[PDB]
UniProtKB/Swiss-Prot annotation, chains A, B:
Protein name: Na(+)/dicarboxylate cotransporter 3
A molecular-function term among this protein's GO annotations: alpha-ketoglutarate transmembrane transporter activity
Topological domains, Cytoplasmic: 1-16, 77-82, 246-268, 326-354, 376-393, 459-478
Clinical condition linked: Leukoencephalopathy, acute reversible, with increased urinary alpha-ketoglutarate: An autosomal recessive disorder characterized by acute, reversible neurological deterioration during febrile illness. Patients exhibit reversible leukoencephalopathy and increased urinary excretion of alpha-ketoglutarate.
Length: 513, 513
């Protein structure tokens, strides 16, 4: 009996190397089964998928696999694979990351968070709502991991202040603890989907769209925002109601108010650098939104068509951060010859940005773009579309529901970015098989790959919440089951009601034929 | 009198913002002077050059200027500028940086350095030669900055041990101190030119070659090595002789021997991880060299022509570092059921690589590639070639000498990478005007932009050496003047004697017409 467990722990200890060395052998029959070029491309894609799901390699290292495999297997030369890793979508990602680094450098995110917490209130339903709104709003511009890791200590402090009898009171307290600790990562994942730069899978959608459908340009920052933000709000409200009912029972209040006000005071007075960063963030968001919202003529019409993009706007805005002074300039300094002549601190130095930008995620997005390019060039997409013939009779709405359910189930065990990278070409080819708009299938998959609620391994925010130690696996599972159901239903509603008007999904686009 | 100095320090305090805001106004007449597209491209290039030379912005931030300026000015759209930042040359750079990070992580560079120092000897001429050989060898694979910063403390310790009378002895000691402290950065800059991954300007040459001359493929790791390594050795020996004559006078020895042996002992026993990293480095170098050396059939002939590259080899080799165990595997562990089952440490984790890879230099190379692409597409290269008509009567050897002198003078005040980025399109167009091989002019410029010897601002290794505090500006200037002269002469000799055979420079290539 003990020997079986011994062999089990032996295999689990070396699972990385075992998976790494046995996955190519297991996937070898794929090469012989399919035509050579398509078979080798499918082998590469499946190997990358397995390595991502098992993290047999670092995710960014696995994302570098196309550069090796595509040239050796003749799918795509080096000078074609390597430039796919810096398409303009990834530079928009870099600009968003730099802006988030500037925001977090000056603690603007903490000031906004504590302000929202003060305005929302302190009642348990209201305080859950404030936590979720804050985390979702901050995850639209910062990473979900950073938003969760910054919001969790504040929630812990407020909960300690609130609770600073017997079975009833202690179980009520415990359920409140769990509700607060589970509302934050859920709301971070919710808010990450509202903006294109909020989460990596949206930018994966953009890049793989550029690869599969080069003439598709209707999805940008403004259109994605006007589609996803109302959906984000509806699902945030549904999650708040569900969590309050499950946990919140849908002098302590004074103590919590005092703690929040005290931490806001500990933030200190508002600085000139914080104001400048806030102004630049507002300019960033507004110029991204108003460049080409597809239903008001944007300022991109004033320039050469087909030249500007969201990446250019983002890079231009974040370039200001690297020379704009962080201390307020004064004209009296020029006249005051006795004043010190120390060099001014800029809003963001490049060293801080470099040490805060997640280059691993940038390389992961690049690997996804390169894999999409290889899948298109090798003809593997045509082969998948040919094999997808049994599903041509599925109604489009039912197809959306099924692919959303499948992707939401898959993302519970793998990272969102890897899941969407693997499933997006299949979604595009399935849209081709149903004669529907490719976005009508690709957008629900991109949104649903972020529906990671049931397990700590589903998404890093879930792991951060679980690290608190007072959340159980079963509690997260039973909350995330209904979270996934409500997310799938709301995604279907959004995709069948107002995504049709925003992305013009009613008719089959010409570039998709 | 004091008022003039006051105004001077006021202007110098705000030189960053003053240059940043007045350079576009100063360069505005360029747009009206030239045809619109070429004029705007020249404006962008000149603005980037000024910002690089003044570091009015961070170098990587200035390298992001094409993404903004080319689309607004209609030179190049976003989807064309942004992919130029990850051409396969930059992935070869990334693989080299990852391999250097792996080497420095396990202190293999220090072990190699101390071993070479023990073998060379301790006599002052021999010890200078050992320091220079060590630094030049380590700079072929590590950055010049890192090599200088690692070699300087060892030189300081050895010098303290050696010297642990009156005017003669103290001036002899001081000249020895200066000779050691100046031989290290010079040798680092010397060795950086020997390999393509040794210094960024070589990879700038590769990328701008890909842009200007897409069909040119004769320059790779093996050909560049066989050209530059003998030139590197000749110039290293000349510099050693010059420095020994200038400074070295071309129980203390026992004490220095003891210190070197003691530090080697302090390195500890050779580890399995160090051996594995050394084996992987040897494989990296050998497979890069033997892939296509252009005069022995390489292993790239076994695959699809035009698909493999040095980037693929580098990425494939460095991928092994991210899963190869750092502790020696044992088959007895499988049978020993009582042994601990801790997960093995790999040779390099992605976190360490990410925090040690200089992403700023990668972005700088990308900005250079994008600027070359914009210069080619805008027609600015044609305009420059048209304006270069007074120089069509210059003999090619004299042209090489003059461009090398000009570039070596310019690099004394600006960074090597920015200098070569700015001057390379001019060199290519000047090669077109003389009906000579483009490499015959482009290679000398790439080599000479690394001839930065006279000032601390010339190259970061010079700044590191000056930070010791016992090197004067005049000493560095008077050593670097003859260093530059010898470098220019040896570069002319190499380019007119054996570069012709290696790169087939005798005849005008068809792709250059
Ligand atoms: C931790 C361990 C677990 C890790 C899990 C996560 C990693 C894997 C995630 C993906 C799921 C498994 C792999 C995908 C399904 C199997 C793919 C496959 O083998 O496709 C080829 C297969 C055989 O086709 P064949 O019979 O040769 O066709 C003859 C007529 N042309 O084709 C068929 O049988 C026909 C139907 C093909 C449908 C599409 C197949 C590709 C789907 C993914 C594309 C990317
Ligand atoms: C693009 C045009 C320029 C930008 C928009 C217009 C100017 C916005 C304000 C300028 C910058 C304000 C300072 C920077 C931090 C952000 C504001 C904040 O949360 O600060 C807190 C403060 C209110 O609290 P406070 O008074 O500081 O409390 C202690 C003293 N009793 O806050 C305040 O007093 C200011 C509250 C500002 C509320 C702005 C609401 C949104 C405006 C439009 C944004 C559009 C883009 C959205 C994405
Ligand atoms: C710290 C402060 C100092 C910083 C120094 C570092 C930054 C600058 C480094 C480069 C040197 C200065 C700039 C380059 C030289 C001047 C370039 C220029 O203005 O070119 C246009 C100029 C005028 O041409 P135009 O008279 O209009 O021609 C009519 C007939 N077609 O053309 C001519 O007059 C004709 C000759 C043109 C020769 C080539 C010009 C471009 C060279 C660089 C290309 C990149
Ligand atoms: C591609 C084929 C595989 C790689 C080449 C063949 C195997 C090379 C050796 C295996 C690894 C050796 C250990 C790793 C560190 C590198 C060697 C080193 O400097 O270690 C020091 C040691 C000699 O000193 P040691 O004996 O340790 O001193 C204390 C005890 N008295 O050193 C030694 O004892 C070993 C000396 C090895 C010298 C190698 C010389 C170059 C070989 C060809 C390289 C080609 C590529 C060059 C770029
Ligand atoms: C890597 C792990 C986790 C997932 C499983 C991968 C391997 C074992 C699977 C994935 C898809 C499978 C293939 C799917 C279809 C066929 C067609 C036919 O010829 C039977 C075998 C063959 C060729 C299978 C062999 C085994 C296979 C390659
Ligand atoms: C710069 C931002 C952050 C603050 C200033 C106000 C904003 C709302 C301004 C600045 C520039 C403006 C744009 C300038 C030009 C055009 C083109 C015109 O055919 C329609 C309106 C439109 C698209 C404007 C919309 C409003 C706009 C975006
Ligand atoms: C636009 C042109 C004409 C003029 C530009 C003037 C700029 C360069 C001047 C105006 C006011 C100046 C600031 C005034 C006061 C200080 C504080 C002192 O520690 C020096 C830096 C700093 C922060 C100065 C930096 C340079 C500055 C921003
Ligand atoms: C989240 C809650 C509020 C609603 C979720 C229910 C989902 C499944 C419902 C709400 C709206 C529904 C859609 C409304 C209208 C149409 C048009 C019709 O020609 C086909 C079915 C279709 C496309 C429906 C499919 C199912 C649908 C998307
Ligand atoms: C930025 C600093 C450091 C360098 C100098 C840049 C400015 C002042 C220089 C660079 C090249 C110059 C131009 C070179 C040639 C011409 C052609 C003719 O029409 C005379 C003026 C004009 C248009 C010059 C105007 C000034 C100019 C734009
Ligand atoms: C793998 C390395 C580091 C160590 C093993 C020995 C090296 C020298 C071996 C391994 C593979 C070998 C190559 C394999 C195939 C060919 C093609 C043939 O037409 C010429 C020789 C050439 C180009 C070989 C040269 C030597 C070579 C590069
Ligand atoms: C090639 C196939 C058939 C077998 C692969 C076996 C691999 C996975 C085995 C063989 C020897 C093993 C190593 C033996 C000893 C140790 C020390 C212990 O702290 C666990 C990790 C580590 C470092 C093991 C890692 C896994 C390992 C490398
Ligand atoms: C560094 C020391 C040893 C030598 C440096 C002197 C340089 C300037 C000398 C050495 C070799 C010389 C070359 C040797 C042969 C030829 C071929 C002839 O048809 C034109 C001149 C040319 C191309 C010479 C140019 C000048 C040259 C490059
Ligand atoms: C270690 C991770 C990468 C493994 C790559 C294995 C590639 C195997 C290819 C087999 C199919 C083609 C045979 C000619
Ligand atoms: C038919 C042409 C290609 C033949 C070989 C295909 C498989 C190559 C695998 C190389 C793996 C290299 C890992 C470092
Ligand atoms: C009373 C309001 C004072 C505001 C001070 C800070 C202003 C920051 C402006 C930043 C502008 C950035 C784009 C040029
Ligand atoms: C702050 C650094 C970037 C400045 C860019 C200025 C661009 C000016 C362009 C002028 C020529 C075209 C006029 C239509
Ligand atoms: C003729 C078409 C282009 C006209 C405008 C050219 C200059 C644009 C400059 C934009 C600068 C933006 C800085 C953020
Ligand atoms: C006596 C020599 C012992 C050598 C031990 C270390 C061997 C490292 C081998 C690394 C191979 C990497 C490519 C598979
Ligand atoms: Na986010
Ligand atoms: Na997930
Ligand atoms: Na170097
Ligand atoms: Na220089």
């Amino acid at each position: 009996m003990a020997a079986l467990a011994a062999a089990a722990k032996k295999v689990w200890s070396a699972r990385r190397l075992l998976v790494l060395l046995f996955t190519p052998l297991a996937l070898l029959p794929v090469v012989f089964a399919l035509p050579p070029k398509e078979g080798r491309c499918l082998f590469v894609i499946l190997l990358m998928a397995v390595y991502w799901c098992t993290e047999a390699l670092p995710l960014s290292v696995t994302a570098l696999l196309p550069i090796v495999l595509f040239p050796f297997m003749g799918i795509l030369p080096s000078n074609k694979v390597c430039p796919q890793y810096f398409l303009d979508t990834n530079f928009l990602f870099l600009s968003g990351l730099i802006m988030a680094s500037a925001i977090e450098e000056w603690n603007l995110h903490r000031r906004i968070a504590l302000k929202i917490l003060m305005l929302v209130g302190v009642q348990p339903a209201r305080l859950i709502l404030g936590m979720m709104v804050t985390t979702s709003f901050l995850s639209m511009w910062l990473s979900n991991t950073a938003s969760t890791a910054m919001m969790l200590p504040i929630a812990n402090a407020i909960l300690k202040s609130l609770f600073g009898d017997s079975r009833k009171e202690d179980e009520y307290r415990r359920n409140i603890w769990k509700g607060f600790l589970i509302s934050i990562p859920y709301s971070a994942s919710i808010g990450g989907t509202a903006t294109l730069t909020g989460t990596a899978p949206n930018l994966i959608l953009l890049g793989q769209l550029k690869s599969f459908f080069p003439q598709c340009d209707v999805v940008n920052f403004g259109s994605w925002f006007i589609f996803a933000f109302p959906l984000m709000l509806l699902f945030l409200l549904a999650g708040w109601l569900w969590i309050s009912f499950l946990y919140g029972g849908l002098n302590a209040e004074d103590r919590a108010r005092a703690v929040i006000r005290e931490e806001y005071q500990n933030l200190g007075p508002i600085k000139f650098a914080e104001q400048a960063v806030f102004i630049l963030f507002c300019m960033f968001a507004i110029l991204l939104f108003t460049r080409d919202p597809k239903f008001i003529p944007g300022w991109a019409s004033l320039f050469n068509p087909g030249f500007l993009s969201d990446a250019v706007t983002g890079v231009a805005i974040v370039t200001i951060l690297f020379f704009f002074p962080s201390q307020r300039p004064s004209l009296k300094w020029w006249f005051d010859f006795k004043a010190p002549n120390t060099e001014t601190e800029p809003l963001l130095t490049w060293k801080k940005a470099q040490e805060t930008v997640p280059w691993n995620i940038i390389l992961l997005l690049g690997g996804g773009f390169a894999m999409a390019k290889g899948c298109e060039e090798s003809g593997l997409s045509v082969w998948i579309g040919g094999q997808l013939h049994p599903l041509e009779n599925v109604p489009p709405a039912l197809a959306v529901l099924l692919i959303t359910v499948v992707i939401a189930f898959f993302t519970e065990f793998a990272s969102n970015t890897a899941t969407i990278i693997i499933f997006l070409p299949v979604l595009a080819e399935l849209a081709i098989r149903l004669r529907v708009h490719p976005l009508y299938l690709m957008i629900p998959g991109t949104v649903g790959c972020s529906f990671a609620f049931m397990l700590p391994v589903s998404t890093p925010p879930n792991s951060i919440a679980f690290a608190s130690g007072h959340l159980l696996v079963k509690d997260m599972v039973r909350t995330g089951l209904l979270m996934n159901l409500m997310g799938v239903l709301l995604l279907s509603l959004a995709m069948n009601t107002w995504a049709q008007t925003i992305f013009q999904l009613g008719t089959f686009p010409d570039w998709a034929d």
